[PDB]
C-alpha cells in the first residue's frame, strides 16, 4: 500500500465472520486471537561488554492493522489498491472472480452458498 | 531473466502489481529495473444472478462473471468491465439445476431465432 | 551489578534543528518510560503517526508541533473495509499504467 | 477507433446452412 | 466427438460431448449445469469422418415451430 489503509467498523457479517483477521479489542496491540497465536508461540549478563540483538525497523505494532491495510487492499480491489486509488469492492463474487480462472465457474459459490459460506466458515 | 526476458506471473517479484514488462538500465555497480504494472483505479459495486436456470436449466460462464446494473444482465470478464449479452456461446452444460438449490430465473440469448426467416 | 547501562540518543537531524532526545534503556525511573526503556526529551501523546525512527518495544518518534520531539505508540492504519455482500462485487473499470523502481546491488570492487 | 485495421471478409459456417437446410 | 445433424458435425467448442449411457450432454472438468443443446451452442466445419470414432445426434431446429 502506498496509502495507509484501513479496517471496518461494522460487523455486517451474516454468514461469514470477518473478525479473526479484523481485530478484537481484547489485546493492547491490534493483535487478536489469531495474532495472539502466531507470535506468542514464536518462543543482559551477555551485555557486560556490548553485545545485543538488534531490532529491525517494523516491530510488533504497525502491521497488525497494516495487514488490515492489506485487508483493506486484497478484497477491496482484489489487487489494484496497491499502486493507486481504491474504494469498496466486495467479496462473495471475489469468492467467484479469482475462481473464474480455476477452471470452475462463478456460481459454484452463489447458490449452495448458505452451505458453502458455512463450509468456507468451516474454512474458518 | 524472469522479468526482462519473458512475461512472468510472479507478483512482488517483478515489481508491484500484475507484471507487464521490464526495462533494465545499467548503473554504477548496480542494475536498475523499471516496471510496468496493470494496476486499475476506479470501481463500483455490481449485482449478480446466481445463474440462469433457463429451460429448467442452469448456465455457467466460460472465463468471467455474470453481473447486472439490476435489470439488464451482463456477462463480463474478470479484470476490465466490458458488459456483454449472455449468449449460449458463453455457456456450456453439465447436469441438473436443483440439486444445486439457490439459483434465479432468467433467459439466455440464442442467435438462430432471426436467421431462417 | 548496578550499572546495567545502554544509552541512546535521538535527533531528527542536523539540518532541521539541534534539540535532541535521550534514551536510557534499562531503568525503572519530561520523563516517559517504555519497555524499551526510560526516555527523556520528548512528549507522549495518544495520536497516530507512521514511524520515522525506531525506539524499541513498539515506540517511534518524529518532530512535530513551537515544534519539538514527540514519541508515541506507532500507528498501524486507518479504518474501513469491504462492505461484504453474499452476492456482490464490481470490476475495477478505469485503469492506470504506473512505474515503480527496484534497486539491486551487482558487485563491489575487486580489492587485493 | 483502432489504428491499422485491414478490411476483409469473415467466413461463416452458418451461410452454407440455409442453402442446405431449405 | 460430435453431433452430426445436417451432413455436418457439431464440434467441441470448449465443452466435450458426454453421456450417462442413453441421453447426451457436453461438459467441462469442473462443475455442474443443465441445458438444451441448440443451434447456437453447436457449429459446423464439414462432414463427420476425419477424426477417429465419431458418434451420431441431431441438432434441434428452434425456428421451425414459431412460424405455425
Q: Quickly list DSSP for A44-104.
A: --GGGSS------SS-TTSHHHHHHHHHTTTTTTSSTTTTS------STTHHHHGGGSSSS
Contact present, A and E (at least 3 Cβ pairs less than 8 Å): yes
Please state, in angstroms and rounded to a whole number, the distance separating the CA atoms of residues B4 and B23: 6
Using a CB–CB cutoff of 8 Å, tell me whether A101 touches chain E.
no
Please state, in angstroms and rounded to a whole number, the distance separating the CA atoms of residues C22 and C89: 52
Cα C25 versus chain centre, distance = 17
The approach used to solve this structure was cryo-EM
Q: Give SS3 for A8.
A: coil
Q: Quickly list DSSP for chain B.
A: --SSSS----TTTSSSSSEEEEEEEEETTEEEEEEEEEEEEEE---B--S-B-TTS-----SSSEEEESSSSEEEE-SSS---B--BGGG----S-STTS---B----B-TTTTTT-
Taking an 8 Å cut-off on Cβ atoms, the answer to whether D21 and E6 are in contact is yes
Please state, in angstroms and rounded to a whole number, the distance separating the CA atoms of residues A27 and C55: 21
Grid cell, residue B92, equals 456450456
Which residues of chain B make contact with E15, given a CB cutoff of 8 A? 92-93
Q: What is the β-pairing status of strands C101-105 and B30-43?
A: antiparallel
Using a CB–CB cutoff of 8 Å, tell me whether E35 touches chain A.
no
Beta strands in chain C (DSSP E): 7-10, 21-24, 31-33, 38-40, 43-44, 53-54, 59-64, 68-73, 92-98, 101-105
- Residue the block writes with cell 480455476: A102
Taking an 8 Å cut-off on Cβ atoms, the answer to whether B91 and E13 are in contact is no
Amino acid at each position: 500500500v502506498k496509502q495507509i489503509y484501513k479496517t471496518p467498523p461494522i460487523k455486517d457479517f451474516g454468514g461469514f465472520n470477518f473478525s479473526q483477521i479484523l481485530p478484537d479489542p481484547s489485546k493492547p496491540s491490534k493483535r487478536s486471537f489469531i495474532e495472539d497465536l502466531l507470535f506468542n508461540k514464536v518462543t543482559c549478563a551477555q551485555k557486560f561488554n556490548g553485545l545485543t540483538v538488534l531490532p529491525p525497523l517494523l516491530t510488533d505494532e504497525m502491521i497488525a492493522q497494516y495487514t488490515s491495510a492489506l485487508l483493506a487492499g486484497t478484497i477491496t480491489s482484489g489487487w489494484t489498491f496497491g499502486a493507486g486509488a481504491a474504494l469498496q469492492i466486495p467479496f462473495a463474487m471475489q469468492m467467484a472472480y479469482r475462481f473464474n480462472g480455476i477452471g470452475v465457474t462463478q456460481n459454484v459459490l452463489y447458490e449452495n452458498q448458505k452451505l458453502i459460506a458455512n463450509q468456507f466458515n468451516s474454512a474458518i | 531473466s524472469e522479468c526482462v526476458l519473458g512475461q512472468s506471473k510472479r507478483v512482488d517479484f517483478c515489481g508491484k502489481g500484475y507484471h507487464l514488462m521490464s526495462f533494465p538500465q545499467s548503473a554504477p555497480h548496480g542494475v536498475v529495473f523499471l516496471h510496468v504494472t496493470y494496476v486499475p483505479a476506479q470501481e463500483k459495486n455490481f449485482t449478480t444472478a446466481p445463474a440462469i436456470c433457463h429451460d429448467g436449466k442452469a448456465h455457467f460462464p466460460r472465463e468471467g462473471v455474470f453481473v447486472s446494473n439490476g435489470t439488464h444482465w451482463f456477462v463480463t470478464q474478470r479484470n476490465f468491465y466490458e458488459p456483454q449479452i449472455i449468449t449460449t456461446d458463453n455457456t456450456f452444460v453439465s447436469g441438473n439445476c436443483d440439486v444445486v438449490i439457490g439459483i434465479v430465473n432468467n433467459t439466455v440469448y440464442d442467435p438462430l431465432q432471426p436467421e431462417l426467416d | 551489578p548496578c550499572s546495567f547501562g545502554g544509552v541512546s540518543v535521538i535527533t531528527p537531524g542536523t539540518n532541521t534543528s539541534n534539540q535532541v532526545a535521550v534514551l536510557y534503556q534499562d531503568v525503572n525511573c519530561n520523563v516517559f518510560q517504555t519497555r524499551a526503556g526510560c526516555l527523556i526529551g520528548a512528549e507522549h501523546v495518544n495520536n497516530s503517526y507512521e514511524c520515522d525512527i525506531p525506539i524499541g518495544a513498539g515506540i517511534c518518534a518524529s518532530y512535530q508541533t513551537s515544534q519539538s520531539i514527540i514519541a508515541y505508540t506507532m500507528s498501524l492504519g486507518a479504518e474501513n473495509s469491504v462492505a461484504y455482500s453474499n452476492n456482490s462485487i464490481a470490476i475495477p473499470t478505469n485503469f492506470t499504467i504506473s512505474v515503480t523502481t527496484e534497486i539491486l546491488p551487482v558487485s563491489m570492487t575487486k580489492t587485493s | 477507433v483502432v489504428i491499422g485495421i485491414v478490411n476483409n471478409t469473415v467466413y461463416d459456417p452458418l451461410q452454407p446452412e440455409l442453402d442446405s437446410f431449405k
